[PDB]
Amino acid sequence: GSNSPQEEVELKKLKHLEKSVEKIADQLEELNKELTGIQQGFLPKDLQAEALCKLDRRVKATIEQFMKILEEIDTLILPENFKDSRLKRKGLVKKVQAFLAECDTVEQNIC
Amino acid sequence: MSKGPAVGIDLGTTYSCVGVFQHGKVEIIANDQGNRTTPSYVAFTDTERLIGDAAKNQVAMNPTNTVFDAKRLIGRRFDDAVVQSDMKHWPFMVVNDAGRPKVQVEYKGETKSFYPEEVSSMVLTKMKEIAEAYLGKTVTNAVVTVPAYFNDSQRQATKDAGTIAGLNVLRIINEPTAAAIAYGLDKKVGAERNVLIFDLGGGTFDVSILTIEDGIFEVKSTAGDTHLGGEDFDNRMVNHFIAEFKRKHKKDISENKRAVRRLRTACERAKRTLSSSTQASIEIDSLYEGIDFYTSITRARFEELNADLFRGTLDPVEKALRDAKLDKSQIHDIVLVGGSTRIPKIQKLLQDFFNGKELNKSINPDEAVAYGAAVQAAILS
Ligand SMILES: Nc1ncnc2ccccc12
């Protein structure tokens, strides 16, 4: 094996970023549950559109947090021999991009 | 809290800085987020008013209600050419109230308007709090800086922002005078001194020429470009990369705002690396349509993309020398201030213009104005 102590430093930064992604994803899931709640809830049709548009600040904050994660991942420089770090970085960006696409569906369905 | 010392505040267009003279030296004070400069931003939301980093951090989410650039409005009439030209580019609304501009925002679900000195007082309140949090003492006395070209109305409005924030403004001093004080140019023995201040930072470019005799300062001339800074250099890099992505992949990323932002953030960082290294590397996974963007830029390539802008900084220098009725050989001291003066090419062009003369650059350029103001504040205590 060629596993280096220096790559452990990079994998640790990536794991912190993964944990931060998990936290934002939990907020996106609470937004999806609140969105559904208003839609199939006790509010009249007219009062639902207002309640749903009140989630906009929160959905925009979720998108911004995923954007700042992307910017942070983008500061990493990983040499070609850091295969596990390069794979984890790629996987994490794609996971964030799939969560961003979900944020866009929410954003297009409120207001 | 017990009574504290006097502080020096650099109230900037984009960022503000606070310093304190203690134990025979100036200490630049870090904010709650640990930053030595604080964004001159104020955001109004559905529930709160945010200032500084917290206000800048949520601008992408609340662009219309996030105010910045208040310094470009302070002490001006609504019909001023500067007000009319700048408002086209701001996401927030600027309205006319009896000939005076006011920023208009949505705050706690209500339409509210504020004068530029009320916005600047919120930024000064934050600087005052940053100083108190570090010192553990009450801060009331301060020296606040203004550009040398500020008029009676712009200086009075800045002092009024100080008063509103609960500050006792010991003195309002010119930014170039503050930078000259930081280097102790006023303390150098001999006859009259001709000082050139080269200020490239916080979205503006200012060239000032001053004369110092027996500790007395006189502004002989001012010149510059009110809309030149680091962002322009970043834009050139972004354009270069967008064109490089087209050449390599035959894809246009410029209509994807998120791809452009990731690229822009990475260019800002590569620009800062090029001030101390001759090459900067960038790795952006899945930038656009799943394509990874791994590239690099040399210092030379960066200098070339910005060649006209960099050379262009000498035109205000020549204009300032002409208005002060001085030859370049008559300048005793050259002072660099503003983060963009850290660019090696800018230093090279300026030193070559002054026939190899050494530049005063040891004080962090972003902090030198607050440094000089803190020294002045200690002298006035
Ligand atoms: N604003 C800056 N421009 C160029 N180089 C830099 C290097 C370090 C910090 C700020 C800058």
Numbering used by the authors:
A (entry chain D): 149 to 259
B (entry chain C): 1 to 381
Question: Could you give the paper's own sentences about this structure?
Answer:
The 70 kDa heat shock proteins (HSP70s) are an abundant family of ATP-dependent molecular chaperones, involved in many cellular processes including protein folding, prevention of protein aggregation, modulation of protein complexes, and protein transport between cellular compartments. HSP70s consist of a conserved N-terminal nucleotide binding domain (NBD) with ATPase activity, a substrate binding domain (SBD), and a poorly conserved C-terminal domain which terminates with an EEVD tetratricopeptide repeat interaction motif123. The two main cytosolic HSP70s are the ubiquitously expressed HSC70 (HSPA8), and the stress-induced HSP72 (HSPA1A)3.
Crystal structures of HSC70-NBD/BAG1 bound to the unsubstituted quinazoline scaffold 10, the 7-methyl 4-aminoquinazoline 13 and the 6-methoxy 4-aminoquinazoline 16 all showed a similar binding mode to 8, confirming the quinazoline scaffold as a stable and attractive start point for fragment elaboration. Compared to parent fragment 10, elaboration with the carbocyclic ribose mimic 23 resulted in a 7-fold increase in affinity. By contrast, and to our surprise, in all HSC70-NBD/BAG1 structures bound to carbocycle-containing ligands and small fragments, phosphate-binding loop 2 adopts the distorted conformation also present in the nucleotide-free HSC70-NBD/BAG1.
